[PDB]
Each structure stands twice: as structure tokens, then as C-alpha cells.
């Protein structure tokens, strides 16, 4: 009943495709390394360019 | 050049308005109305007059009340927003000691509210409502307290307790027994920060507006006395 | 011998300066401590710091060397600043007592009656009244004495003493000590009555299931002030009415016992947990 929707809904979550954890970790590490030099919080900027100084 | 001059006027106007509004914010005292089901909050607030508000003034003092019956929920998480109120008003139906039990649920609710982490320093003004139906049930009634609360059988009225005029001893004994169970929870874990103020009010009574005023004044006086280490 | 007294005086000066500078720094640095009541306390701390940095060291030097080695103008300035500090370090206590009285007896109107605007006006008025009875009668020669010893000592620039006529001696005492004393007594009596009534209410309400703190607090607050300052202002009036009743040494001793009160105010008015936490961080 209400359960049937629940059964149907849960069955829906079963039929998906999953990738290995190593691939996801490699992708996250690659993104973080690629954009590692374009943020001020990690790498401090010269005091001239800081607008709050 | 012109930008700073333009911004200065706006800043000055906003600051002046905030300075004006600070006084009216500080003047008013906020209360919270919280009661059990079928207790009688509506008649009390009506006699006083998803959210309901009320503003009233006594002796040139502004009070401003908050009913929260809209989001009534089994689980309360909006209780965090109310840690800055002056007092909490609790309305409980005294005559419903055998129906649905209901008084046990009310006592559990009071115990849960009392020991909340965010409401450690908030007092409670307690109105034991429906005072006439209780007398009607007690005076020659089929159902008596000992049947539902076993401890009532041995209990007797305090000697120093002062009964009202023309009151049967049985009614007074039951009425004080009901109050004792509520005060027992408060005295257990108070530790001096907050107290409880029991009262006996019906629907017809109209002097509650003075009781709330006096209790708020006493609460503020006790807070100020304790702050300076004299109490 | 002389050195031991010298050794003490240094400890007194160090304590008086250190406590007050710590209190002022703690109040100034932290945002939480700013309050309407904390303006009076910082005014008192500033007055005590001025006293302990100005009048105690020069007086100690004079008593050790037994001869004033500065000019007449300098010791006149010293007398004026000493009287100013003494008469400004008591009306602040009176104002604090009155503020507590308003806060306790009239809780609803406390917010409206005392605001950040009125506190500055009150402090300025108190300081102006204090400086009106110190510099005006001393820089002008209205307070000077007439008898032979005083006029003989006035011209000499080696010794600077304190000789006054009856009028100034009585008037300064009335302005500085007794008027604050009666106000503080009446205020604390009313405050004690309020606490007694509230304890009676609580005991009547919930005595079955379950006055010392107020007595101790009032006792310390009144006793420190009265014991420190009361004996001096009796002999101050006495030595004028009676010519030879009181010697010089007893007068000097009572006066120096009076100065010690400036070293106990931080230990009395700054025992709140907020102050303790604030001291923790600044200290460490």
C-alpha cells in the first residue's frame, strides 16, 4: 500500500550504476590539486591586492 | 567623491532610527504562552484581550505575549529561540485527572521543559486551570484520586496551608496534593537560578493580569538581587 | 630602621598601581565588560591610580627625608591634588550605592532612569564638585591659618605642613565624608529590607521541601570603608576645636591609614566571575 510505493521507491534506488572509490578519490584529488593556486584563503595574497587591508 | 557623501546621510539616518528603536525594544517584556491540550489557553488569552501575538499595558508597563499553538509538534526544536524571554506561562487542566492519563502527560511535559539545556535560567508561572470542575468531581464523586494516583490515600493537607472561605476539607486536600506534585519537580533541580509560581485560576476570574505583573516584578527583583551576591 | 618603613611604602605603591592598572586594562580591552555600572568603577579606579601615582610617593619621600626639598608651589600643588583625590574617591562609592538602590528597589524603571548618556554627566559633575573644593580654596589663600607657627612655617621653603582654619577644616569634612556616609547607610538599609522580604517569600512558598550572604556582603562593604576613613575625619574636626588635644604623629598615622583604602577597592568591587575570566586571559 503506502508500503507499495515504499517498495517501489526503494526498488528504484537499487537500479543504479556505481564506480569504484579509487576513481572518485583520484578525481577529487585531481580537482583540488588543479585549483590549488587560485584561492586566497590557502595561499595568502600580497597585502596590496587585499581589499580589506 | 560624491559616493561617500551620499552614503554618509544614509548611515546617519539608519543609526538614528536604530538609536530611537533601542528604547522601545528595551522597554517591553516578552512572555511565552505554552499549555497542554484542552487546557484552556484560548479563554485565558481572550480574557487578557501559525503564530499569535498580543500586546497589552498595565501601570505604564508593556507586555507582549506569544502563543505557539500553530506548530504544535511532538518534537520541539523551535524552543531554542525562546531562551531570552522573561517568563514562561504554563496552563494545565487540573480537573482532567482521569480522562484519556492526561495529568501524567502534563507532568512529563513540565519535567521535560524544566530540564531543557537552553531554558536553564527561565522561570515558570503556572496556572492550575478549571478549578470548579475539580470541586464538582471531588464533592460526592464516583471517581476519586487514590484510584488513579495511589499516593493520595495517605496524604493529608498541610497544617500551615490556608484554605479559602467555605471550602470543604476534601477539596483543599486534593487541590494541595495536585500542587505538591508540580513543586516537587521544580525543587529537585532548581539550584537557585529559576523558580516556580503556582496559582489557582478559573475561567471567570479576571485578576490574573495582576498576578502576571507581580510575578514578573518578583522575577526581575530576584535576578538583580542574585547578580550582586545578596541572595 | 628607616629602611623597613621604606621597604613597606614601596610595596604599598606597587600594589596600588598594579591592581588599578590591571582593572582598567581588563575593562578597556574586552567588549563584554562594558556596562552602565562599569563606568563608575573605572572612574574610581582612575582616581585611585592618580592618588597612588601622585601623593603616596612624594609623601613617603618627605617623611623619609624629613625635609621638603622642592618649592612652595610644588607642595601646594601636592596638597591640592591629594585633597582632590581623597574627596573624589568617596562620592563615587555613594553613586555606586545609589545605582544599586535603583536597580534593586525599582526594577522596571532602571532601564529608563539610568542610560549611557546620564552616566557621563553624573561622573563629570562629581569630578567637577570634587575639584571645586580642592583647587579653589587652596590655590587661592582662603584656607591659610593665622597663628604664629603657621605663618612662620609658610615663608620657609624647607618644610611644608598642613595648617588650616576652622571653616575649611569643617567644610571639607562635611563635603567629603559625612554626606556620602548617611546616604550609603540609608541606601543599604533599604536594600537589606528588600532581601529579607524576598527570603521570607521564598521560604513561605517552598520551605517544606528544602540571611547570611547579604549580611556578609553588606558587612564587608560598609566595614572596610568605615574602618579605613572614619577615624581620620574625627581627629580632623577635633584638632581645630581643641588646641592641644591631638599631637602631630597621631594625625599623620591616621591619614596614612586612610590612604590604604585605595588598595582594597579592586578586591571588593571586582569579584564577579566575568571579571575573573577577563583577568585570566589578560594575565595568561
Amino acid at each position: 500500500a503506502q508500503a507499495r510505493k515504499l517498495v517501489e521507491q526503494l526498488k528504484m534506488e537499487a537500479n543504479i550504476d556505481r564506480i569504484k572509490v579509487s576513481k572518485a578519490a583520484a578525481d577529487l584529488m585531481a580537482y583540488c590539486e588543479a585549483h590549488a593556486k587560485e584561492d586566497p584563503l590557502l595561499t595568502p595574497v600580497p597585502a596590496s591586492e587585499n581589499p580589506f587591508r | 567623491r560624491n559616493e561617500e557623501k551620499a552614503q554618509r546621510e544614509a548611515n546617519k539616518k539608519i543609526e538614528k532610527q536604530l538609536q530611537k528603536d533601542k528604547q522601545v525594544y528595551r522597554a517591553t517584556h516578552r512572555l511565552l504562552l505554552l499549555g497542554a491540550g484542552e487546557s484552556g489557553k484560548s479563554t485565558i488569552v481572550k480574557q487578557m484581550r501559525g503564530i499569535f501575538e498580543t500586546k497589552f499595558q498595565v501601570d505604564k508597563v508593556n507586555f507582549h505575549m506569544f502563543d505557539v499553538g500553530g506548530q504544535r509538534d511532538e518534537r520541539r526544536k523551535w524552543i531554542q529561540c525562546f531562551n531570552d524571554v522573561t517568563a514562561i506561562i504554563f496552563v494545565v487542566a487540573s480537573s482532567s485527572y482521569n480522562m484519556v492519563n492526561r495529568l501524567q502527560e502534563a507532568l512529563n511535559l513540565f519535567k521535560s521543559i524544566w530540564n531543557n539545556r537552553w531554558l536553564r535560567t527561565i522561570s515558570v508561572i503556572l496556572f492550575l486551570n478549571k478549578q470548579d470542575l475539580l470541586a464538582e468531581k471531588v464533592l460526592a464523586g464516583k471517581s476519586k484520586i487514590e484510584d488513579y494516583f495511589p499516593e493520595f490515600a495517605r496524604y493529608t493537607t498541610p497544617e500551615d496551608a490556608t484554605p479559602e472561605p467555605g471550602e470543604d476539607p476534601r477539596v483543599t486536600r486534593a487541590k494541595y496534593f495536585i500542587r505538591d506534585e508540580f513543586l516537587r519537580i521544580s525543587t529537585a533541580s532548581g539550584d537557585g537560578r529559576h523558580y516556580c509560581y503556582p496559582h489557582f485560576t478559573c475561567a471567570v476570574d479576571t485578576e490574573n493580569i495582576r498576578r502576571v505583573f507581580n510575578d514578573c516584578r518578583d522575577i526581575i527583583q530576584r535576578m538583580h538581587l542574585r547578580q550582586y551576591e545578596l541572595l | 630602621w628607616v629602611v623597613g618603613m621604606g621597604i613597606v611604602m614601596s610595596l604599598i605603591v606597587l600594589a596600588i598601581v598594579f591592581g588599578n592598572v590591571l582593572v582598567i586594562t581588563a575593562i578597556a580591552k574586552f567588549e563584554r565588560l562594558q556596562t552602565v555600572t562599569n563606568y563608575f568603577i573605572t572612574s574610581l579606579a582612575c582616581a585611585d591610580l592618580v592618588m597612588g601615582l601622585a601623593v603616596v610617593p612624594f609623601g613617603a619621600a618627605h617623611i623619609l627625608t624629613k625635609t621638603w626639598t622642592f618649592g612652595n608651589f610644588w607642595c601646594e600643588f601636592w596638597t591640592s591634588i591629594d585633597v582632590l583625590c581623597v574627596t573624589a574617591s568617596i562620592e563615587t562609592l555613594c553613586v555606586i550605592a545609589v545605582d544599586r538602590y535603583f536597580a534593586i528597589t525599582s526594577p522596571f524603571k532602571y532601564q529608563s532612569l539610568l542610560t549611557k548618556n546620564k552616566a557621563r554627566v553624573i561622573i563629570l559633575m562629581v569630578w567637577i564638585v570634587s575639584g571645586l573644593t580642592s583647587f579653589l580654596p587652596i590655590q587661592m589663600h582662603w584656607y591659610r591659618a593665622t597663628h604664629q607657627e603657621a605663618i612662620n612655617c609658610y615663608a620657609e621653603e624647607t618644610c611644608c605642613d598642613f595648617f588650616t582654619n576652622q571653616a575649611y577644616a569643617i567644610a571639607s569634612s562635611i563635603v567629603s565624608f559625612y554626606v556620602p556616609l548617611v546616604i550609603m547607610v540609608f541606601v543599604y538599609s533599604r536594600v537589606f529590607q528588600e532581601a529579607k522580604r524576598q527570603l521570607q517569600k521564598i521560604d513561605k512558598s517552598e520551605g517544606r521541601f528544602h540571611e547570611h550572604k547579604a549580611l556578609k556582603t553588606l558587612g564587608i562593604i560598609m566595614g572596610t570603608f568605615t574602618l579605613c576613613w572614619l577615624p581620620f575625619f574625627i581627629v580632623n574636626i577635633v584638632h581645630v576645636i581643641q588646641d592641644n588635644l591631638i599631637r602631630k604623629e597621631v594625625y599623620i598615622l591616621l591619614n596614612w591609614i586612610g590612604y590604604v583604602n585605595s588598595g582594597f577597592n579592586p578586591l571588593i568591587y571586582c569579584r564577579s566571575p566575568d571579571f575573573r575570566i577577563a583577568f585570566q586571559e589578560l594575565l595568561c
Binding site: 577529487l28 | 554618509r8 500553530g70 | -
Partner: protein
């Protein structure tokens, strides 16, 4: 009937078996040869005053200059970070507000609270432009998906997608059990997540209107959630003093951030521009900075006299702002 309830479990297990077979290693094992970023010290730059009561919400502007904030005295104030001078002061009909938002185009501002009504204001005309009603509980968050449609989550275990022009709900999301505390939109504004009060986070589809995944890692209420810049991960902060980084494609968590000296809940979570530093606000009146790749603490942002209840990072990644119950806003850098 009975068979149907029984029928479901073979399904729950298949899910568990698939997730267990998917895992091959832990994120810590791979992320072990990276040089640490080192100790990080942040200093206060600006402090904004003017709120008479405690603060619940704030939201940085799209231009990285302006921001909005709400307080329990019933007042919305728009600031200017550079010059620290107020711009607007909008009074509120109800004194209880729990959230606020700021339009991407900088033309509208939304706010809602304990009354079950969402309000919208027009900055460039300041009068109420639209009021949205239909929820049966208090609101918790609201985000402008665009200039014409807003998505909100309420305390009645539902979320909705509104239409400002007509004022009626378009799609309704259901499936949660307890209250809903927070949400965040994807960078492409096609998917959004939520954090429920029953220790579960779900990934929704805006266009379809149906749930796609569910994560059940935590143990207590989930109070905040933030979405990874890449778009394939998100971080949740619960009331049991832990943070977790999940993954949509792997459909399971990777790392956890916890320490033995804290027993306080977490009220806010945010990322940096590059996704390396994860900032969380605690009930100990201070803030902590983590390392998203190593679970090693890298700094503390202290200075607030009461609990931290709001946190945000500029779109240009120049500064981070904090709000606390002490009615003060601080700009760190």
C-alpha cells in the same frame, strides 16, 4: 500485504551488498603522500555593529561586496563589507525569522521564520512584493534558484518549489520522516540536497521531482550541509560533533572529521574556493578549520562571545564571514 513489507528487505540488502562491493580502499590510504598545508592563522579585518539581538542567518552577495543578515528583533540589514556602512534597514511584520537569502541578480531579498510564511522584498523600486503561504510548519531555509522561482524547506517534513509571479506551489518533495533543517543548490541549479532531522540526507531532482539517493551515515540530527564545488560531493554537520564527506557517484561516505576534546554540536558548514579547507562552526563560541583530504585540524577562529550560528564564504573566495548570538558580524581573512 504482509508479503509486501517482507518484500522490501531483499531490497535493502542488495543495496548494502552493492555498496560494500563498490568499496575498494579508503580515501585516507590514497591521500597519504601529499605535503600538508601547514598551520593557518586568520585575523579579523572588519566588525559590524547595529543588531539589537541575536543573529540566525546571513548570505553573501553575488558581487562579493554586499551581504544581508537577520536578527531576532525583527529587522533585515544590508551591509557593505568594504566601507562598513549600512545601506538598508527593512522592518519585519513578525519578530521571529530563521533564514534569509539574496538574489543572484541583486534585486530581491527573501526571509521567513516561525510564522509559516515566506516573504519577498524588492530592493530596487522597499515594500513587500510577494507573500508565499501553504506550509504547515516553520521554515528553515530558502534559496533563490532564479529571479522568478524560489525553493524552500519547512519543518513539516516537506520541501517545495514556488513560482513568485503566480504565488502557487509547482512541485512538492516528500519522503522524509522528521524535520528538514538545511539545503544547498548545485552549481548548475538542477539538483539539490537536504539534511533531515532523522539523520538522513537525500538528493533530489528539480525537474523530475523525485528522490534519487539516500545517505544514512550520521547518528543524530543534521543541522547544516554544503555542496562541493566540483559538484560530486557534499559535507554534512550533525549534533554529535562530527562532519562527514559523502560522494554521489560512489554512493557512500569517504572520511569523517572528529576529535576527542569536543562534545558540542555543529551549527554550520562551508567549503573554500578550491575545496581544500572545510570550515565548521561549533557551540564552543569558536570556529574550526579542517583539511578536507587528511582530517587534520589546521586552525581555530576564536573571538566570539556566544555560539556561532551563521557562516559564509565569498564567491571570489576572498574572505569568510561569521555570525554569532552576540549580535556581531566579523569578516576574517
Amino acid at each position: 500485504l504482509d508479503q509486501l513489507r517482507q518484500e522490501a528487505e531483499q531490497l535493502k540488502n542488495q543495496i548494502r551488498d552493492a555498496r560494500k562491493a563498490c568499496a575498494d580502499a579508503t580515501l585516507s590510504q590514497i591521500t597519504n603522500n601529499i605535503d600538508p598545508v601547514g598551520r593557518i592563522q586568520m585575523r579579523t579585518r572588519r566588525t559590524l555593529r547595529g543588531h539589537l539581538a541575536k543573529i540566525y542567518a546571513m548570505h553573501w552577495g553575488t558581487d562579493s561586496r554586499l551581504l544581508v543578515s537577520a536578527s531576532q528583533d525583527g529587522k533585515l540589514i544590508i551591509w557593505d563589507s568594504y566601507t562598513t556602512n549600512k545601506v538598508h534597514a527593512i522592518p519585519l511584520r513578525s519578530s521571529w525569522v530563521m533564514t534569509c537569502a539574496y538574489a543572484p541578480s541583486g534585486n530581491y531579498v527573501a526571509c521567513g521564520g516561525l510564522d509559516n510564511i515566506c516573504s519577498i522584498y524588492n530592493l530596487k523600486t522597499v515594500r513587500v512584493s510577494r507573500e508565499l503561504a501553504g506550509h504547515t510548519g516553520y521554515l528553515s531555509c530558502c534559496r533563490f534558484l532564479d529571479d522568478n522561482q524560489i525553493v524552500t524547506s519547512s519543518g513539516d517534513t516537506t520541501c517545495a518549489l514556488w513560482d513568485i509571479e503566480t504565488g502557487q506551489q509547482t512541485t512538492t518533495f516528500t519522503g522524509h520522516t522528521g524535520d528538514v533543517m538545511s539545503l544547498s543548490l548545485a552549481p548548475d541549479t538542477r539538483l539539490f540536497v537536504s539534511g533531515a532531522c532523522d539523520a538522513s540526507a537525500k538528493l533530489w531532482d528539480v525537474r523530475e521531482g523525485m528522490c534519487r539517493q539516500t545517505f544514512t551515515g550520521h547518528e543524530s540530527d543534521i543541522n547544516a550541509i554544503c555542496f562541493f564545488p566540483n559538484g560530486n560531493a557534499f559535507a554534512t554537520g550533525s549534533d554529535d560533533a562530527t562532519c562527514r564527506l559523502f560522494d554521489l557517484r560512489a554512493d557512500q561516505e569517504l572520511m569523517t572529521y572528529s576529535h576527542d576534546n569536543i562534545i558540542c554540536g555543529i551549527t554550520s558548514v562551508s567549503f573554500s574556493k578550491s575545496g581544500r579547507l572545510l570550515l565548521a562552526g561549533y557551540d564552543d563560541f569558536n570556529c574550526n578549520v579542517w583539511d578536507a583530504l587528511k582530517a587534520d585540524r589546521a586552525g581555530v577562529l576564536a573571538g566570539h562571545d556566544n555560539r556561532v550560528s551563521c557562516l559564509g564564504v565569498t564567491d571570489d573566495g576572498m574572505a569568510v564571514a561569521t555570525g554569532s548570538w552576540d549580535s556581531f558580524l566579523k569578516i576574517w581573512n
